Amino acid sequence: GTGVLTESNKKFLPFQQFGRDIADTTDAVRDPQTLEILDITPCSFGGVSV
């Protein structure tokens, strides 16, 4: 996927590996190598008006 990866303060259980949102899309993940809880947010967007 594509998005902005930020450190997440949301704690994970030791067995927890990924966090999912209401829409059943991954929003928080744990890095495979260095075990950190990383937040995933889509890159900024918007409508453009003239």
Binding site: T6, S8, D27, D39, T41, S44
Partner: protein, 48 residues
């Protein structure tokens, strides 16, 4: 603000509040704004 004895302080705007709203309006604003959600403007401000 004298009006022949009639008292309009409750409906008249109150300069004391930063928002120039009457005391009645403040009660209305607080009671119904429950689901107004965040005014974070959906910028990068709400990281999560």
């Amino acid at each position: 603000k004298y009006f022949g004895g009639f008292n309009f302080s409750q409906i008249l705007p109150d300069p004391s509040k930063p928002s120039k709203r009457s005391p009645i309006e403040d009660l209305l604003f607080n009671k119904v704004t429950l689901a107004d959600a965040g005014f974070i403007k959906q910028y990068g401000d709400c990281l999560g």
